[PDB]
């Protein structure tokens, strides 16, 4: 069966907390999402998500929709946790 | 079916090197590997594996073994690429 796990969204789990303003020279669309994960124990870090870009409801949800990277010789979860359903 | 991808080993793709000495104060036990991977278009990081820790062969592999993080707030795949077999 599965994958790498974000299983959720804790109904607690519903958030969007927007870190900022609007910036310029430096400028800030911040939404942001409580999660956790699936290890060894189901668990609790923070998805700091996309501002065009819409809360995840309440469920069980996976991997990449970009979200691993290089970034060097590399990958990188930077760029972001994306997310989608379990399939 | 699938996962995450580094399909692999190309036979290229054999390595490990270990960019160090002996370390102490700082030390050094570096393998290293080429790998590749599937995106949009299969492709090229290095895997800087562990050092107990021989060479991945040959094929396709997959995800986490320890791998993503958290370090914060976030998954990181800071610790390791690691790989296992498709499955």
Redesign the interface.
Known sequence: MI??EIKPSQAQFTTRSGVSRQGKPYSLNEQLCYVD?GNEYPVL??I?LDEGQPAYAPGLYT??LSS???GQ?????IDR?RLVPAK
């Open positions: 994958k790498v994960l870090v923070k700091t991997v990449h691993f990277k290089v010789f590399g990958s990188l979860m946790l």
